[PDB]
Design a protein around this nucleic acid. Structure first.
Lengths: 82, 167, 434, 106, 80, 83, 162, 73
RNA sequence: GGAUUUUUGGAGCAGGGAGAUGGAAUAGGAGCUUGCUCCGUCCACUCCACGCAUCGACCUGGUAUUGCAGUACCUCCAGGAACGGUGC
């Protein structure tokens, strides 16, 4: 089977090696399943180092990113296909 | 004219990204935002271009924002000499064009005459040179762009002005 | 505006539309069970729309009590009437009508075509209120509390019989220590169950049932709700016995009943509410848990095909006399061969002359029309649409070629010894030179 | 139209305050130097005026929004269920009436 | 033989996956291939110090998983 | 077998790309020579080492084993891999 | 005319000019602000070019919003619950709008995130001490009429109108 | 099963980032299809500016995730 | 087809010290609730060694450029550290 092959072409939050979520309009898979995420961005925790300061995420966009196979912790859908 | 509109005459102590945010906020109104080509190298500093969906949109942002105050000096916007790479990969009804080039390319002349709601056709008088007659399938469109073209620059060596054809 | 009048106008429209929608929804029904649960919720919510109308209209005296004395005069009239009417005599020449002056509440509290929902009814349904097997009111979620109890007790025989016995009864000596977090876990499973019950009984007064359950928690447990004959009175949420009723009461407010035990009257408040809610939900769904247990017995002992599917719950052509066509004849006619006609909705044809006549048959005709190209012969047997369009493209070019168009061909000299076409000649002729 | 509907609303406002059969706030408006085109009973708009008057009365009954307001509607889904069932019972009797009338006429 | 094939006995199966980034999730996965590739669905996931985040169609990786929990009505010898 | 990922890497090699590595070593520059094992040779790159002094070196050999991602030509969005 | 989630899902949610997620709905004259959260947490800009929205109101809970186009609209006033529904909001560009009096600046100050704003082409523009009212009420602002705010302007705007 | 393209870079100077944040400054000298680039005249660079000449480092691509160039080759 | 480049993993973890400095309403133990004493999770202020440097963006005023091209990022001086990860 090729499970993701139905859920590709939509903006999908792929998870990282370090716990980010990156919503790229995913393209395709492999045997290593290295990701080719188009119209793809990222966002990770802006750690306050404290509690009276709160936690946010600063916006980063790569556009089209070729995430090497060692990346995925998961792949979920966060945007329908445009 | 052009759908790629030049937007310049602002300050340089302002950032490219920040002035881009300002231009987006102030351009989604008069036109559509497709892409802001902004270079802050020295050869073209303090200037950028916004590629709007419509050529009349870009020239109308130019004619309304004909010196709109912003960023250290009232910014001036006009049409460009050509169009951007995205759009590159993508009173009467009839009026005589005086100072009509014996050199103009009928393609760009057509894009000029069809700036308006689609023109009928342009007829560059091929006898005694330097005359034309253009008709528009919408007479209000013809008169609109012909009045806004009274003194219009095309090939800036001249001003191409179209008035209502006589009786 | 009209507050002590127009406010009542809006409230009357709202309550009347609500009453019509309620009458229709509570008189006619549907077949679906998720739809039935959602529709009981929707009848309660229509009562709730009338309820917002009533919360506006029942305390709406700030306009009535004061305007009933100023509008309680019997002298004036056409003066104020003429002020209003001379304001109303503005330019209202806008000749058009409006049924969106009385025609809202039917589209608000009526049924739809695909889902019987009104203006509010864009998301009216048991959407998140029905799980996979739960069935909108057929099964419930005991698996999650079962998994929590499994991870808590960790018993090599905590199996179907023990689970069902712990989840069916009300207040027996429990199969786990309630003096640990097992009581709080039962309270959480009971919170899920009570949400399920508040969704499964939606047409009942939720606030009134809450007030009855609150009087229950406040008197019916602690004021001698369980009698006895140590046996005069004891608590299943306190774990303290009584030599008699007065002894129970006195140990309720004594020192060791005030703060001298971590299982005190308030230090057991959360686990006590959990115990009470769980017991009430179980003792109400003694039939519901029973049906769920019967279902579980089926889902444990039923055969694989039925169980999985319920969880998921010679070609011989016709003759005139409607029989098989014999085999040598079938081979002759060669029906085996199928023709992919893309023009016909990817229709595919058996029989070759059949295929061919189809090119003038309807489905091909339609295909053509909607393709934007007439059903002329020139394309017949061209079945792919890009081929068709490039074919008809060059055909178009040739038809326009061999047309004689007087506009570009028929050509006119002006007086000045130079020539133009017919078109331009008349153009500059009638725009004032020629 | 919105203007005609507003005029009908003013007609209902006058019929809510008309306190005598021959004395009211609209007797003046009829022949008082203005147009009065909802004042006809032979006009079909007389029927919509009668409906608007019924609405003004539904607002003018003391239990309808004058000085008392009951909360069995604003917080009452049980009385609402009673009312739904009452409408349904009226509907059942009415279906029986229609069937009997059709049979008798046939 | 391997227990990758034992985890291949899971479809329409109620499982719980504790993954590599301190993750613990309840999931009815979509479909699992020979390299442990088990894509989650309607899953409630919580990484290290997290929330019950929901994924209706998610693709949980292989070697980036740690522990798997099978159904209770799951015969072990019949599953391997 | 052969990866349309590797076809994407081949369409991303030769020009300005921006690789991002494990500890934050991110090199934005001419990713000249990348072999399907992803040991990317970059040329005239500006690499941060996650250090925020994202300094410009020349002809770096940034392995792809640590490569968290790789920002590629935004003009091949209509690739032959996806189309 | 019904403005639905038809025109909000069919809207374009993709790369804006400043490379952010923008969702354009140009060419509808939509006066109905409903059914929007179906951007599905993948959007930061909501654009309603060519709209007739009776005022500024009607948005859903968007903790992410980063740009909104309410220009070429029928904005007369300014609604209240804007901040908790746009905490990430800096760009709420409402030029070519019809705000009139400084009472339409009542919810304008409650945001902690406003820096890039535009209310141009409003009768609140040529009024005296209007930019003074703005530079008083908007603390964290940085982009006002497409030229920086000033500490002198802030001094004037705090000190005046005691 | 394909050797790596260090071919014009061989016998030339690279400053490499290997794991432990370390650097190996040296000459490209020898490798395998395992990419084990071996540096002679290679010196370590620690967290602190301390650097020791190592003689001949056969530095496995097991860790070294970077290496920059000293010349054009 | 679990051994130096991707999918049988090097992942886990913990935030530097102190002052008769303080907040836990609904949540910690004992001295058998209230009062009060000591005790094993943070942040605000202040003392060190604003946990230490780099750089980047920005806020401040001054300051150079009027210019056509598809961007990692393009002024200079000076302050402050509101924010990020890199060496200890």
């Amino acid at each position: 089977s090729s499970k993701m092959l139905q859920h590709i072409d939509y903006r999908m939050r792929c998870i990282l090696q370090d716990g980010r979520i990156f919503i790229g309009t995913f393209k395709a898979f492999d045997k290593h399943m290295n990701l080719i995420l188009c119209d793809c961005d990222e966002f990770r925790k802006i750690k306050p180092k404290n509690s009276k300061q709160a936690e946010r995420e600063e916006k980063r966009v790569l556009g089209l990113v070729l995430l090497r196979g060692e990346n995925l912790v998961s792949m979920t859908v966060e945007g329908p296909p445009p | 004219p052009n759908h790629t509109i030049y937007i310049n005459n602002m300050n340089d102590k302002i950032k490219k990204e920040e002035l881009k945010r300002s231009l987006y906020a102030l351009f989604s109104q008069f036109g559509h935002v497709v892409d802001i080509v902004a270079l802050k190298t020295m050869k073209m500093r303090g200037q950028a271009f916004v590629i709007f969906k419509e050529l009349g949109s870009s020239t109308n942002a130019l004619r309304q924002l004909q010196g709109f105050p912003f960023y250290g000096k009232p910014m001036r916007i006009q049409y460009a000499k050509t169009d951007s790479d995205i759009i590159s990969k993508m009173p009467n009804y009839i009026l005589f064009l005086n100072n009509l080039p014996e050199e103009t390319n009928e393609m760009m002349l057509s894009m000029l005459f069809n700036q308006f709601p689609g023109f009928k056709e342009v007829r560059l008088v091929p006898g005694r040179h330097d005359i034309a007659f253009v008709e528009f399938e919408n007479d209000g469109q013809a008169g609109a762009a012909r009045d806004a073209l009274q003194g219009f620059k095309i090939t800036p060596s001249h001003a191409m002005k179209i008035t209502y054809a006589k009786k | 505006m009209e507050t002590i009048l127009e406010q009542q106008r809006r409230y009357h429209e709202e309550k009347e539309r609500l009453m019509d929608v309620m009458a229709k929804e509570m008189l006619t029904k549907k077949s679906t069970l998720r739809d039935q649960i959602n529709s009981d919720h929707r009848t309660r919510a229509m009562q709730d729309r009338y309820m917002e109308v009533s919360g506006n209209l029942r305390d709406l005296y700030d306009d009535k009590d004061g305007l009933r004395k100023e509008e309680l005069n019997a002298i004036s009239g056409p003066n104020e009437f003429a002020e209003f009417y001379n304001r109303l005599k503005q330019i209202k020449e806008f000749h058009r009508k409006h049924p969106n002056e009385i025609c809202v509440p039917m589209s608000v509290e009526f049924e739809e075509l695909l889902k019987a929902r009104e203006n509010p009814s864009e998301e009216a349904q048991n959407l998140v209120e029905f799980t996979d097997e739960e069935g909108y009111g057929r099964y419930l979620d005991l698996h999650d509390c079962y998994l929590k109890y499994i991870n808590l007790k960790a018993s090599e025989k905590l199996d179907y019989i023990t689970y069902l016995s712990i989840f069916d009864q009300l207040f027996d000596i429990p199969k786990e220590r309630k003096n640990a977090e097992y009581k709080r876990y039962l309270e959480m499973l009971l919170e899920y169950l009570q949400d399920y019950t508040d969704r499964v009984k939606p047409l009942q007064d939720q606030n009134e049932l809450f007030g009855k359950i609150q009087a229950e928690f406040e008197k019916k447990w602690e004021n001698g709700t369980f009698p006895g004959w140590e046996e005069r009175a004891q608590r299943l949420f306190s774990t303290k016995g009584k030599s008699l009723e007065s002894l129970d009461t006195s140990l309720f407010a004594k020192n060791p009943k005030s703060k001298g035990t971590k299982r005190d009257t308030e230090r057991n408040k959360d686990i006590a509410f959990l115990e009470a809610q769980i017991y009430e939900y179980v003792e109400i769904l003694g039939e519901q848990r029973h049906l769920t247990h019967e279902n579980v017995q089926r889902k444990q002992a039923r055969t694989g095909e039925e169980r999985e599917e319920e969880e998921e719950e010679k070609n011989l052509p016709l003759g005139w006399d409607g029989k098989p066509i014999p085999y040598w004849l079938y081979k002759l006619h060669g029906l085996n061969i199928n023709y992919n006609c893309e023009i016909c909705g990817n229709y595919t044809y058996r029989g070759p002359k059949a295929f061919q006549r189809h090119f003038a048959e309807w489905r091909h005709a339609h295909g053509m029309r909607c393709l934007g190209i007439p059903n002329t012969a020139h394309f017949a047997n061209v079945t792919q649409i890009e081929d068709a369009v490039s074919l008809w493209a060059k055909l178009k070019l040739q038809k326009a070629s061999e047309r004689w168009q007087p506009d570009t061909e028929e050509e006119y000299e002006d007086s000045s010894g130079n020539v133009v076409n017919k078109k331009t000649y008349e153009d500059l002729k009638r725009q004032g030179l020629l | 139209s919105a203007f005609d509907l507003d005029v009908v609303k003013l007609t209902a406002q006058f019929v809510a305050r008309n306190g005598r059969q021959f004395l009211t706030q609209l007797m003046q408006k009829e022949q008082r130097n203005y147009q009065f085109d909802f004042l006809r009973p032979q006009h079909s708009l007389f029927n919509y005026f009668t409906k608007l008057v019924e609405q003004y009365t539904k607002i003018l009954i003391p239990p309808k929004g004058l000085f008392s307001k009951l909360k069995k509607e604003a917080e009452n889904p049980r009385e609402v269920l009673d009312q739904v069932c009452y409408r349904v019972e009226w509907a059942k009797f009415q279906e029986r009436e229609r069937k009997k009338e059709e049979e008798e006429k046939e | 033989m391997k227990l990758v094939r034992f985890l291949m006995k899971l479809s329409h199966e109620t499982v719980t996956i504790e993954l590599k980034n301190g993750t613990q999730v309840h999931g009815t996965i979509t479909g699992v291939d020979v390299s442990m590739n088990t894509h989650l669905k309607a899953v409630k996931m919580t990484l290290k110090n997290r929330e019950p985040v929901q994924l209706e169609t998610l693709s949980i990786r292989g070697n980036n998983i740690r522990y798997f929990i099978l159904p209770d009505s799951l015969p072990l010898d019949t599953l391997l | 077998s052969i990866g349309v990922p590797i076809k994407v890497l081949h369409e991303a090699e030769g020009h300005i790309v921006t690789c991002e590595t494990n500890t934050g070593e991110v090199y934005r520059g001419k990713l000249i020579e990348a072999e399907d094992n992803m040991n990317c040779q970059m040329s005239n790159i500006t690499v941060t080492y996650r250090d925020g002094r994202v300094a410009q070196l020349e002809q770096v050999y940034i392995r792809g084993s640590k490569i968290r991602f790789l920002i590629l030509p935004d003009m091949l969005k209509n690739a032959p891999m996806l189309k | 005319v019904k403005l639905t989630a038809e025109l909000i899902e069919q809207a374009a949610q993709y790369t804006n000019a400043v490379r952010d997620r923008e969702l354009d709905l140009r060419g509808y004259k939509i006066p109905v602000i409903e059914n929007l959260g179906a951007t599905l947490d993948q959007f930061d800009a909501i654009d309603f070019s060519d709209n007739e929205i009776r005022k500024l109101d009607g948005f859903p809970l968007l903790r992410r919003l980063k740009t909104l186009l309410v220009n070429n609209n029928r904005i007369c006033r300014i609604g209240e619950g804007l901040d908790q529904a746009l905490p990430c909001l800096t760009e709420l560009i409402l030029t070519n709008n019809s705000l009139v009096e400084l009472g339409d600046l009542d919810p304008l100050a409650s945001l902690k995130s406003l820096t890039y704003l535009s209310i141009l082409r409003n009768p609140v523009t040529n009024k005296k001490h209007y930019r003074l009212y703005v530079i008083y009420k908007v603390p964290q602002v940085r982009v006002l009429d497409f030229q920086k705010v000033k500490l002198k302007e802030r001094q004037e705007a705090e000190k005046m109108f005691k | 099963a394909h050797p790596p393209e260090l071919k014009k870079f061989m016998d030339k100077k690279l400053s490499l980032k290997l794991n432990g944040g370390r650097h190996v400054q040296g000459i490209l000298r020898g490798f395998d299809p395992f990419m084990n680039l071996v540096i002679d005249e290679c010196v370590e660079m620690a967290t602190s500016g301390q650097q020791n000449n190592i003689g001949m480092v056969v530095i496995r691509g097991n860790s070294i995730i970077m290496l920059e160039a000293l010349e054009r080759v």
